[PDB]
């Protein structure tokens, strides 16, 4: 039902082993809420997503990303539930900063994140580490804002939600990981160039709004409001199906916008231009992978 | 210092009478905190800004816009002081929604004065434009409640989150809306929401807002406020003030160059719409230069 003009890509050749190793790591780190087939299948699903998003990565880099996918799904759920079940924003803030603090210098999640970070950190330069950390700090701010909305029993206005969703989605982190997974790093002058930044935002919006459309049933069952469809219903005073259609239109316009923008990328140098082209291709791969996965993942379905 | 590539324009020829009339309206409505000459000169200065920002508007439209400039300065200051002096976000939210609720109809000096402005503006605009303005007001309210959140939590927001929220707290999207009202030429939703046009609107918002942060830093820090690009840079990048001014100027200048490029590739819609879009973009240019010339000399900063 959504515009997805990007072709599918063969997943990483070691996808099966990746899922097995990742599941064992999540268990050993104590991150599984239970050992039901539903829970284990979800972890296997996240690992399938990772293997389709970064199909050309060296195995051990993909393994670290894969661990982060599962770690983040679980910890974001913990932080969401903390807020949904009535915690003050200060408590949500303390939880996030306490766990993510290991990126600069605590229950199951701090130690497990430190383990991921030790492996990723060894394969990346400082300027990229600061870039990822900033995107994490952006996400934390976005999550504390969500917690404030819940404390105030508020549905955010659409323009503000769409902006903040770019942070809560963590997709900027997963663009960062395109560089890590390919071992091809872009200088700040490139990713911060306003045209490239708008490409990154558009791809974020495509993936995040697709997630919203497909994750709507789960989030509404959870009494959560941070979903483009719910936000559209409240702002425009429309019913669910009409809001789905508006959300799809917004998604599709971002797709068209992305495709236009990437035809007019700024130029820097033969080497940087080639790395930027691989980075943008990585975003295209991620978008299609996310699209196909969202339709079938048991997390939403 | 800051890049301003947009030539200046003569102000509205009735600028002097406009300032006199606006001051008398501001006094009659009871919005003046006191009758000192520096308070009165602030109103005169904001009316001078209005007369430079919409120099071709019919006088009665410019007059309503002018009353809103001064109304907004005073009321935004009341909301800032409410939060700076310890109010919980819910109190800030209630103050804002109670006063701005009159944009939807009759429901305090500020609410009555806003209703008077809105009665006049509404008589000269279609419904879709009124909803657009009201939505941008609601975005700004969300932005202000978020600032109150940060102050309650003693948080300096990370830069990317601040820059996105600053687009709403600046109210510049409302003043782009007023370009349509001032010229009595209204763009359909499909045009202003087109992602390329939206990015033009955002870039212009950033140019004006980040210039305002740079020039309005000395007074915002004497107010114990952190919602300023320069301060946000110091905390995020761990740099000293002059370095942060330099970074902020570079970010401003990159948005300017981005804007200059984007407006050469506007989408086409129809004969009349394209003509009106060209006037709208030119209005943003006029506004940006008018704001630049005024910010350097205004008593407010
Ligand atoms: Mg979430
Ligand atoms: Mg979630
Ligand atoms: Mg979701
Ligand atoms: Mg303000
Ligand atoms: Mg202010
Ligand atoms: Mg300011």
Numbering used by the authors:
A (entry chain B): 32 to 136, 143 to 338
B (entry chain A): 32 to 138, 144 to 337
Show the paper's wording.
The crystal structure of ScCubS in complex with the trinuclear Mg2+ cluster and PPi was determined at 1.80 Å resolution. ScCubS crystallizes as a homodimer and exhibits the class I TS structural features, comprising a bundle of 17 α-helices and a central hydrophobic cavity, showing structural similarity to other solved bacterial sesquiterpene synthases. Docking of FPP into the ScCubS-Mg32+-PPi complex (PPi removed) and sequence alignment with previously characterized TSs suggested several residues that could provide the highly tuned control observed in ScCubS, namely, F104, S206, F211, A244, and N327. The polar side chain of N327 points toward C11 of FPP, the position at which the first cyclic intermediate contains a positive charge. F104 is on the opposite side of the active site to N327, with its phenyl ring well placed to stabilize C7 of cation C by cation−π interactions. 1,10-di-epi-cubenol, however, is delivered by hydroxylation of cation D at C6, suggesting a role for F211 in promoting the conversion of cation D to cation E, and subsequently to 10-epi-cubebol. The “PPi sensor” R202 is linked to S206 via T205, and the carbonyl of S206 is well placed to interact with C3 of FPP. S206 and its neighbor T205 occupy the so-called “kink region” of the G-helix of TSs,25,32 a short, flexible region that moves toward the substrate in response to PPi being sensed by R202.
Terpene synthases (TSs) are the enzymes responsible for the considerable structural diversity found in terpenoids. Sce6369 has been defined as a class I 10-epi-cubebol synthase (ScCubS), and is responsible for most of the sesquiterpenoids observed in the volatile extract of S. cellulosum So ce56.23 ScCubS is capable of making over 20 different sesquiterpenoids when expressed in a heterologous Escherichia coli host, the majority of which are derived from the germacrane, cubebane, and cadalane hydrocarbon skeletons. 10-epi-Cubebol synthase from Sorangium cellulosum (ScCubS) guides a highly reactive carbocationic substrate through this pathway, preventing early quenching and ensuring correct stereochemistry at every stage.
